[PDB]
């Protein structure tokens, strides 16, 4: 589990969105595994606006933050799970690192701010849903 809290937005994995998220919906995209809902309180996270390929992510199944090198956001085939059939996920970045299903939502960050959240995993790989292109998270 986990979310990004930027401005009056809450960014979560679409597959982990709650009823309150769907009832306060701003934007959702199943191909990216992302959903954004509105919040009453202002958050403290800031979004990175860069092309870094190195950063640090939080792994809840280890209670640890790990430094990683990650690929650029791309269209990647992801195996079937309880939440989606086997399909292509867009804006996904891969790295070598530990991930279990419940690690989804952990933040990946670079020197500029939050880069994305854990969205995929298995066999020593971890995948992150990028948010750096969502410029509207910084306003309104
Ligand atoms: N190998 C292995 C098992 C394993 C370990 C660790 C994680 C996973 N699960 C996943 O990657 N996802 C399940 C939630 C939905 C995700 C999505 N964005 O489509 C895909 C699977
Ligand atoms: Zn950066």
UniProtKB/Swiss-Prot annotation:
Reaction equation(s) it catalyzes: Selective cleavage of Tyr-|-Gly bond in the picornavirus polyprotein
Active site: 15 (for protease 2a activity), 33 (for protease 2a activity), 104 (for protease 2a activity)
Residues annotated to bind Zn(2+) 1: 50, 52, 110, 112
Subunit structure, as described in the record: Homodimer.
Function field: Cysteine protease that cleaves viral polyprotein and specific host proteins. It is responsible for the autocatalytic cleavage between the P1 and P2 regions, which is the first cleavage occurring in the polyprotein. Also cleaves the host translation initiation factor EIF4G1, in order to shut down the capped cellular mRNA translation. Inhibits the host nucleus-cytoplasm protein and RNA trafficking by cleaving host members of the nuclear pores. Counteracts stress granule formation probably by antagonizing its assembly or promoting its dissassembly.
Protein name (Swiss-Prot/TrEMBL): Protease 2A
Source species: Coxsackievirus A16 (strain G-10)
Stretch of the intact protein here: 869 to 1008 of 2193
